[PDB]
Design an enzyme around this catalytic site. Sequence first.
Site, PDB file in Angstrom:
ATOM      1  N   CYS B 152     -62.399  25.389  -1.102  1.00  0.00           N
ATOM      2  CA  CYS B 152     -61.211  24.777  -1.692  1.00  0.00           C
ATOM      3  C   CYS B 152     -60.326  24.138  -0.620  1.00  0.00           C
ATOM      4  CB  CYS B 152     -60.408  25.816  -2.497  1.00  0.00           C
ATOM      5  SG  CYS B 152     -59.854  27.296  -1.595  1.00  0.00           S
ATOM      6  N   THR B 153     -60.202  24.801   0.527  1.00  0.00           N
ATOM      7  CA  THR B 153     -59.382  24.267   1.614  1.00  0.00           C
ATOM      8  C   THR B 153     -60.022  23.007   2.222  1.00  0.00           C
ATOM      9  OG1 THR B 153     -58.677  26.526   2.155  1.00  0.00           O
ATOM     10  CG2 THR B 153     -58.153  24.813   3.758  1.00  0.00           C
ATOM     11  N   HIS B 179     -51.900  29.742   1.733  1.00  0.00           N
ATOM     12  CA  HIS B 179     -52.772  30.173   0.648  1.00  0.00           C
ATOM     13  C   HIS B 179     -52.168  31.097  -0.395  1.00  0.00           C
ATOM     14  CE1 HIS B 179     -57.040  29.396   2.525  1.00  0.00           C
ATOM     15  NE2 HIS B 179     -56.544  28.334   1.915  1.00  0.00           N
TER      16      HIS B 179
END
Lengths: 325, 325, 325, 325
Positions: B152-153, B179
Amino acid sequence: TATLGINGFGRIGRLVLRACMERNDITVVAINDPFMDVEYMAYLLKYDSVHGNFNGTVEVSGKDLCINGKVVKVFQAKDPAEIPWGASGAQIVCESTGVFTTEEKASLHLKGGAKKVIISAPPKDNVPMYVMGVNNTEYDPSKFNVISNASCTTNCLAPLAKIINDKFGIVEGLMTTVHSLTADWRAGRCAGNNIIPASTGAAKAVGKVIPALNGKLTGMAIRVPTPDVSVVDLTCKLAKPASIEEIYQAVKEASNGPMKGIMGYTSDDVVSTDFIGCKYSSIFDKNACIALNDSFVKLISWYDNESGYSNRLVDLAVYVASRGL
Amino acid sequence: TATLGINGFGRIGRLVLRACMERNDITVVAINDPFMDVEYMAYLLKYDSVHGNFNGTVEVSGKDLCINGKVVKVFQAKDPAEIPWGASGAQIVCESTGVFTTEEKASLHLKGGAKKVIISAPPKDNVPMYVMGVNNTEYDPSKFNVISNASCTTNCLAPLAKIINDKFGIVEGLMTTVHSLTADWRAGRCAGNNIIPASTGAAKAVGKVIPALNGKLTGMAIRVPTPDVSVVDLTCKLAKPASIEEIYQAVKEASNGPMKGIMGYTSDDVVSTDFIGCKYSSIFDKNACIALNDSFVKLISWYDNESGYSNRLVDLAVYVASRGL
Amino acid sequence: TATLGINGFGRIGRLVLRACMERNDITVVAINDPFMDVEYMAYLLKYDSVHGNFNGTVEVSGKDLCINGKVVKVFQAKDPAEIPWGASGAQIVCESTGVFTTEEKASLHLKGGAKKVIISAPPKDNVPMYVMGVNNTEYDPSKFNVISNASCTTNCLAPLAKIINDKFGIVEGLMTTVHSLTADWRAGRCAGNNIIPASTGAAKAVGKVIPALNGKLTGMAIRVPTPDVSVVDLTCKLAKPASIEEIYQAVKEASNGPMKGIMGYTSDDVVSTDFIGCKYSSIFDKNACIALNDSFVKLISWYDNESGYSNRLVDLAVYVASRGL
Amino acid sequence: TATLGINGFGRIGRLVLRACMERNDITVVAINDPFMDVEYMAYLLKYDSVHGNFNGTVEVSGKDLCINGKVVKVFQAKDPAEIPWGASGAQIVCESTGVFTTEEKASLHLKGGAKKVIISAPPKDNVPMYVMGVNNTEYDPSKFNVISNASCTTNCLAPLAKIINDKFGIVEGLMTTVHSLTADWRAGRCAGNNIIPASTGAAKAVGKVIPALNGKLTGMAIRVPTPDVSVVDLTCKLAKPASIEEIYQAVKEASNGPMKGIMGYTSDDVVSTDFIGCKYSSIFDKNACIALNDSFVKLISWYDNESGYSNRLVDLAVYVASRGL
């Protein structure tokens, strides 16, 4: 022995008093706040959701407070000039209402008998800002009666920035500070479940406290839902290459040397809550730091936005007193 | 029409399925998870504290699930090689258990009849990583049956870094990603009231998806107590000078063109929650970005760490099918 | 001085150890936990997101720990019979793994040389439960080598219920306890974002500790996202009418008499955080209590589900030792 | 089609507008708030930390707003007497500033051309309170121009109490409502970190909405750090015996007929977040209810303290319009 007067019994004002009560070189003699009754002040002093119960006893005596047996005068003047600071015997005033952040307004306390005033926030005008361990010795009693203890974020960044700049030299740096809720349209959104971008003038203020860094730093803030304790994320380019180990060593030197009690460090797997109540202004997190190369690094430094700042404001008063009123 | 099999019915697996139910170009036909009873799987799909109630109907059918009238086969094989993907009519497998992240393990799905496997995480080995809108067209069906959708990052940083690097060139960059909890001794500390430093290989992962950036980026993460949605904080030096406005226009162009649906942007005073459910991989926050000068900037980009990533996996599965099985 | 052995170094075992270190009548001599390295145990004892830094020093020494200059043996045996409790000089074992809640399993510690075992939770079997200040004197050293300290909820409700039942007699009661997160499909839902209905056998446990109340009470729990400190909400019909003032005075008498250090009271405008670290088992909140009439009331009592319980377990250990091991 | 004006564009005001925008039997025509520019209003309307982005389009048109192609006049008068409702054509005003909760203050909206006023809060004077589905038909247009929609809590308890009282009869009851943060010295303490005892007049208010229950109910509140959705915990004694199943059936009957859309029920393992956006006034949680015996029970009912209440106010507005303005 220095005597303190507190205007604005808010989080900061209350924490400053608590910090004084634990010290033998400064005494809180009076408090002023036109929006708080004596009973309410007592309640707010006795209980806190972040700093626990007051270490001692707090009772209301007539119109004043009797903290740990000592008497603390309680006034409620909406005008600084009418606060009997002089009669109270309060030599230095902690201006923490956030409403008199200019020499003009803050100086009104002198008209009340006070000899010095410390604004617990950056000034709107040119009132000199001082960061203990960084430039407080530049203070001159024969030149200033109203000074500023900057902000909680500036007190975290300044000492670290100074150590780094002094040893390796900061060419340019960008800072992001992750703020707890105690540390603009976005600002009004629900704080409990949002990550909220925000403004902070800390990076620039550092440019004033440390002239050599003027124009070399700038930053922003990101508010998160935690109650207390914040962190500084400083990514900067160094003039002279250096490793995290060397940066760590330079910080350790200053911490155990000229910046004792101000700069701190750690190499433990710490998290936010481990710093609640920490009195340091800036604590270097060795393992959290990262570097792309020997001249481009990201430094991480913790700070209890409330405790560190409040204790620095007390150190500053004590220092001021030591310079002669 | 492409068919999908999901291995591991966790947060990602469930969200991938919810994404598919919305689309007409791909359907989920089987789910395998040896650690969840179907009744519980039904429950977890119907209710979610972040994404709300399931849009439609979920019911248990024998040992299988009936979702909106369609029968979704459910299995509980601990050995991927023994999952009847082929017999079930599932062409592509979404490997989201987090336990089979190498070509060796993931390929076992192929023995069960699957034709392609997509690991919902970065590989422990050299399985190729693809980021939709960035390097997905480099995928060669004749060479790979097992690929990775990265993280996702990385799906947030990659598209932004590509744009910036293509238009201005990135000399060097340091990243910090804040996060949320849905995105080590520290990791085990109480997530509900702590700001927790953490690691991420996303900056280096970007160095592979975009070979040009190899060695020019590195970063870390900071975990905070928000349920969903994270932020990428990229501080970098550009080869060519550029103002925030020009960087904004570049992203805007890519967003309205070659990266539609993937790269997004905004100039409103948004906060975390405003992106819950957002399908973009990365959203540039104009007002949050800050520049020290024309060559040293700090870019802020949001991403719903769950929704963006899950939708990209579906996009990739659909893209994979379009290239021939 | 009695000596304690701790099995399972989780939240409870750790606080039990920190409590012992604060007293001179009891010493921790050994810890057993097969899922923790010595290094990790040291870290968990030193840092805590709710109770702050360990009040003292903690170092690793070989395979053991040196806590405040004292050697505490560390073992990692999965079988209770293999733990050298006797050889380590540990007389009483605090069984806090939550997996040996029966005499059969818990007594295995006796094979290791331990003389007494205290299960830090209600038993799955007929092992007797004791609540300090309520029925601990019923303990018979000639009949039991394995006993239970019940639960944190039960330790809060039992003392309050005893006082009310004795003074006014409880005809029937229904309890709701609001649990912090340190105190079933719903149970697995996002904790820091939900109000979660849950179960609790406290009410029934109270009917066993105080036979006269057997079958007269029943309750449930509601879990909330606060880190520590819980509340008991007891709504009951009284045999003899009584005002909140009379009930308060009754609790006051018990608190200053037979239930000293166990039952507490307050009339201040307290909130959750004001009880973090409080050692009482139950604290009556005068101002939060309400009454429809003189025989139908709702009583509110607080309890730091971690500190109160852990200290009660240490009190019970000290007590048990005073009765002949 | 009735026309609505909204005074006080806070959480309730905005959600009331979002609700109107979804119905064809009522139209929002104007909004007034002396503390918001039209730009800020548009921002607060488009984004929400709990209810997602506005479902439609929001554009500033001069000094007014264009919501979904419809014009909405915008004003900013600090005095109701000076708000030009008539001109805009606003027939009924939603008084949601929380400051004008009396007939005297609230009736000033009439001077502006408004015919009817609904206060979105319990009144301080004797203004009549109405709960849709319980006593709204008691409204008399020839005797009232200013009415109240009660409170979010009262709208949850009243319908439930009516059903229970009608079928089994409530002899006496005590309520505790666990309030989310959107639902006194304590009140001022950090909300996102504490469980806070609080007051509510909901139980007594039910005695007015349902005269038969006058003097038979009383209660309190306990605020917790969740963003939205609250619960009612009603512990009462019944005149006629009844099991949880029977109580559930009576609620089901009322819900599927005479109180449709108002009273709801569930038997799933739900948690707080599952009710975000739910428009019901009260949702009976079957599996969370418990009973000591057939006449002493604890009923649990959920409610989105923002969504339910808001939709009820809109229902009340449409109803007031049907009765002739």
